[PDB]
């Protein structure tokens, strides 16, 4: 019961609301989970929506399931990064003699992974900055440019996106983050639905 | 004297200011004000500027008259809302038997209507998020996104918008909201633009 | 040795890459270092960037040499200000009758000049607003809205953009601002790139 995971495109007569994990797939150090979707801005793939990303840094993406991800949302990861220990100014990029100034893969700033949790919500047209980590029942707010890490079920915004308050009672987290039902074999999942709507999926499992 | 506030597009050889009255008089649930205006970034109309309006969740958007809409400018209704009580995917939308998940309008958040007031001037490309309230005379800074209450005469901006400073001590801004200018009928008004212009309309009518 | 920095594009076959200066010389008002360069978006010139640019407001525009500007960056300048002494509502801009209200110069508030300094860095899609000062080495991240001045060699971010952090100690940026090595002819900096490149410029020149 439920869409297909697999399926490009899960809904019918629908090209906008599209499945992640089989779009990037094919894609060298890209993660994601199951059911994570985006919702198409302009009828664009996800893939378009992840720049800069070189297999060389070997910088990884990973997104978790069941996150929901409006259109615009845009994923910067560590290719863009400009050498700064001394100019910024990339002479290697002209030739014409510069080229010998080309930086060394070690002389590069990497910030590291960008990881995202599971039941993550993201607005639409935020923009996601390299090495950030976003845990598990988060919302970020839309137009919001993640620059640090974001705490599990914290609510998120602002550019730098910072966080607003807590989702639920530290207590109530806790138990989610170790329930963990987005790892569920999906038959169980499938008939709690509802206590996973409503939360309630804690006083049962416990 | 002025043109007919009437008129889609008023200026002669322009279709790119646009009086939103009349474009907007024609959806449910939308209010706009008289001379209120929008300057097109690309020629679209401003009622593809209000995203997320659905007649059933009942949220009314509401504007003054006299304001200024620098382009780009966006809305953002109520119908982007998820849930949140419990886990924030939409199930119900991939249908497939979950559909039986289809949440209960008393379930889905509304933060309430969206109201701008007179005589205020939004920068370009802000966004305005769902059941805000600005006040009347209030200036937006461009690129601002707005998620909180802005007070009358009020110079605002920034992600999230936070109040910068006040336009004139309190005295004059509460003379302004008593006397409310662009209440009066425009044969009158008329005859003040300059009183208008320059706030020594407080003076004379006080 | 290097590329001509009067070559639109110095690049051979790319017209992405495209240096600042042989593009906007043609304009008036508008002064740009001999290095700089604007990593196109969607392949359209530079000059598109630059918004609300009026030669009667006479606000200038300044971009030191060997600067890197991203993608989507825009520069918006005093043209698009509302008299706000008053109403802001441009009633002189319907014309009908209207006109007679057009605005003086001096009752138009005009914040300044936009100056831009050397071996600046300024990510994808930043708006700097009117009046601004950004100083010689800064960096600005992607996504900011600068509102107010930059000290140099200081990393910047947010929106408004805020100053985060020194790229580096005083001592290094004191005799930094004071080599300036972006002044000396290219055939001194062609022989001294890689000290540059990692700020061991310092050690020998001082």
Redesign the interface.
């Known amino acids: ?3 297909n995971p697999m399926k490009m495109y ?2 019918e007569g629908n090209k906008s ?1 599209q499945f992640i994990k089989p779009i990037l797939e094919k894609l060298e150090n890209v993660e994601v989970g199951e ?1 994570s979707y985006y919702d198409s801005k302009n009828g664009e793939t996800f893939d378009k929506q992840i720049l800069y990303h070189y297999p060389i840094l070997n910088d990884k993406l990973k997104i978790g399931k ?3 991800i ?1 259109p615009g949302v845009t994923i ?1 990861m560590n290719g ?1 990064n ?10 290697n ?6 080229e010998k ?1 080309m930086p060394k893969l070690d002389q590069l700033p990497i910030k590291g992974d960008t990881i995202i949790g599971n ?1 993550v ?1 993201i607005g ?2 935020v ?1 996601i ?1 390299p090495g950030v980590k976003i845990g598990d ?1 988060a ?1 970020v ?5 993640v ?1 640090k890490d974001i705490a599990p079920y914290m609510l998120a ?4 996106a910072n966080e607003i308050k807590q ?1 639920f009672d530290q207590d109530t987290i806790n138990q989610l983050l170790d329930i963990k039902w987005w790892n569920w074999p999906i038959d169980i999942i499938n008939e709690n ?9 804690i006083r049962e499992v416990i």
Chains 1, 2, 3 share one sequence.
């Open positions: 019961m439920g869409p899960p809904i609301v059911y069941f996150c929901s409006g910067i863009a400009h050498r700064m220990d001394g100019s910024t100014y990339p002479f990029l002209f030739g014409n003699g510069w100034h039941d919500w639409k047209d923009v900055m029942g919302i707010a839309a137009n919001s440019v620059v915004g602002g550019n730098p989702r639905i509802d206590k996973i709507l409503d939360n309630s999926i």
